[PDB]
Paper text:
The antibodies described in the present study target the oxidized macrophage migration inhibitory factor (oxMIF), the activated and disease related isoform of the macrophage migration inhibitory factor (MIF). MIF to oxMIF conversion exposes hidden epitopes within the compact MIF homo-trimer, enabling specific binding of anti-oxMIF antibodies. However, this study revealed that imalumab exhibits an unusually short half-life of only 2.3–7.3 days (56–176 h) in humans and showed a non-linear pharmacokinetic (PK) dose relationship, indicating some intrinsic limitations of this first-generation anti-oxMIF antibody.
However, the L:W93F mutation in L:CDR3 facilitates an interaction between L:F93 and L:I2, which are now approximately 3 Å apart. This interaction led to a significant decrease in the solvent-accessible surface area (SASA) of L:F93 (C0083, L:F93: 70.9 Å2 vs. imalumab, L:W93: 157.0 Å2), resulting in reduced exposure of this hydrophobic amino acid. The altered loop conformation enabled an interaction between H:Y97 and L:Y49, and significantly shifted the position of H:Y99. In imalumab, H:Y99 was prominently exposed on the surface, whereas in C0083, it is now buried near L:T94, resulting in a significant reduction in the calculated SASA of H:Y99 in C0083 (21.4 Å2) compared to imalumab (110.4 Å2). With only minimal modifications compared to imalumab, it maintained specificity and affinity for oxMIF in the low nanomolar range while exhibiting significantly reduced hydrophobicity and aggregation potential due to the H:L5Q/W97Y and L:F49Y/W93F mutations. Additionally, the L:A51G mutation reduced immunogenicity by eliminating a high-affinity T-cell epitope. The structural analysis of C0083 Fab employing X-ray crystallography demonstrated that the reorganization of the heavy chain CDR3 loop was a crucial factor in the observed enhancement of biophysicochemical characteristics.
Numbering used by the authors:
A (entry chain A): 1 to 222
B (entry chain B): 1 to 214
The structure:
Amino acid sequence: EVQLQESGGGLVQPGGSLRLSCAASGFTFSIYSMNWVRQAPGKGLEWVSSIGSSGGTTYYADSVKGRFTISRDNSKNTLYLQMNSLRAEDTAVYYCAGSQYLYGMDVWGQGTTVTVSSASTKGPSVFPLAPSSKSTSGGTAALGCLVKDYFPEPVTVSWNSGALTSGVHTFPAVLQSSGLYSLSSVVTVPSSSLGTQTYICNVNHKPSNTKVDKRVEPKSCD
Amino acid sequence: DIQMTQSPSSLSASVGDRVTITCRSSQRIMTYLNWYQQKPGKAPKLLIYVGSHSQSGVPSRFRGSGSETDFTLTISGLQPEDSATYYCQQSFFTPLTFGGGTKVEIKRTVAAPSVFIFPPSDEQLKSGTASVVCLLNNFYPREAKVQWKVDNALQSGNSQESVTEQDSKDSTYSLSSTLTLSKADYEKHKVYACEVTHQGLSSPVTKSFNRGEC
């Protein structure tokens, strides 16, 4: 199965440097031309750089020329992007992609986030979302977690360590006036299961190294 | 720098319909135009390469055509999972350029939201702030009105809304409205209600809770 696995993304200060990697497997890497493509938050796809199958040819977008350097090691089936003199506008999700056809992109990697900011990374506060006893839900109830006041994007939210996926809705983050982000993750479940079954929201904010597992259940009501 | 003009920027078509996406290049690029699909939260995926070539596994409904400076992607028999953004990309000469993208929405039957309200947790209240969340689950179309009331006081300017991308299976949306108050203000009132209006409801639906009533 043709596969590209990226890594190296993170939060960087303006003017700093960062090196992205992309491991290849499932095809003859030495005959594939490789590329880097990025996607700014809420924007379209933007080409970054290209490299010939042998590494003897490289191409760059005008916005990154002289600051980024694409390279490859065909002995290790690895592609690199060395990003120097990083700017705020370089913030985006970066993808590696390649193909046996020049300038084509047949196999894509999952992506890695790069944030260029002088602001301080802050972890979220995780609060439960649970109804009161007199909620008028039918046979379906809703629980959730509120992930509040974190920076920068992104955060990952799962339920019961990934075992619960059906009915989950993790909303897009909203940028609050404070410059911090906030979102809610909800899941709909049978009403009878609300007050008995275990529901845990797993939150991970890698930039600030903040990871939380919060059990969500209704308030005690005897 | 070959500029790629993609049209329309968005479209809404029902399941089983036939939609067309066009991509124009400022210069001739022969047949070196590729089409990509990007579902919400996923990396782009190749559909068509070099104009009209597809892999065995790309649904027969995905067909590409064109040459020189006019190219088309046709989806014949739209499916729910086809809700995504589609991009064209010229692979002729550098700088490689992408089209602006086309958002495909699946036009399905009306579906009313299931409404839920959540009081602020005791943990958050310790921090001196109260967030009240009203959830509208699995509705269509996207147009919906959420209005907050605190002790019958019509709230305005103190809530924020967030909407998910269209679901890939049922083609519905979900919406969260968060009302933000200080703990002191939260503790001055009793009845917190969110009233939802939507074309799928015979009349507005209201969900509410009373503070301090576990």
